[PDB]
Amino acid sequence: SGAIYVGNYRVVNRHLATHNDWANLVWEDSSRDLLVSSTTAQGCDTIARCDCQTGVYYCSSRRKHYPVSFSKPSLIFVEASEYYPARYQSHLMLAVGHSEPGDCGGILRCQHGVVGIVSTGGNGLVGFADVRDLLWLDE
């Protein structure tokens, strides 16, 4: 679990969005596993606007943060799960690291701010849904 809170927006994994997220929907994209909802309170987070390929992510299944080198946002095949059919997920970045069911929503940060959230795992890999291209989150 986990979310980004920036301005009057909440960014979550689309497959973990609640009834309240859907009732306050701003934007969603199944191909990216992202959903953004509106909030009444002002958020706690800053979004990175950069091309960093290293950072640190939070892994809830270890209660620890790990440093990672990750690929640039790209179109990657993701196997079927209970939440999606087998498909290509866009704007996804991969790295070597631990991620299991439950770790989705953990934040990946570089020195400039939030980069994205955990969206895929298994096989000693961890995948992050990028949010750095969503410039409107800042306004």
Q: Which residues are catalytic?
A: 15, 33, 104
Which of the listed partners (ligand A1BP6, Zn ion, none) does 84 bind, with a CB threshold of 5 to 8 Å by partner kind?
Answer: ligand A1BP6
122 binds, among Zn ion, ligand A1BP6, none (CB under 5 to 8 A by kind): ligand A1BP6
> According to CB under 5 A, which one of 15, 65, 98, 112 is a site residue for Zn ion?
112
The reply, when asked if residue 110 is annotated as ligand binding, is yes
Are the beta carbons of 132 and 49 closer than 8 angstroms?
yes
**In the chain, which residue ranges form alpha helices assigned H by DSSP?**
19-23
- Which residues, 6 or more positions from 115, have their beta carbon under 8 angstroms from its beta carbon? 48, 52, 55, 93, 108, 109, 128, 130, 131, 132
Report the partner that residue 121 touches, choosing among ligand A1BP6, Zn ion, none (CB closer than 5 to 8 A by kind). ligand A1BP6
Question: Can you tell me the distance from the alpha carbon of 21 to that of 12, in angstroms, rounded to the nearest whole number?
Answer: 9
26 binds Zn ion (CB under 5 A): no
Tokens found for residue 77: 């095949």
Phi, psi of 10 (to 5 degrees): -125, 125
Structure tokens at 16: 């973990």
Q: Residue 110 is encoded by which pair of tokens?
A: 């570089």
CB of 86 to ligand A1BP6, least distance (A): 9
**Which residue's CB comes closest to ligand A1BP6?**
121
110 binds Zn ion (CB under 5 A): yes
Question: Is 98 labelled as part of a ligand binding site?
Answer: no
Q: Hey, which residues between 45 and 84 contact Zn ion (CB under 5 A)?
A: 48, 50, 52
**In this complex, which beta carbon is closest to ligand A1BP6, that of residue 55 or of residue 97?**
97
Q: Does 129 bind Zn ion (CB under 5 A)?
A: no
Cα maximum dimension of the chain: 39
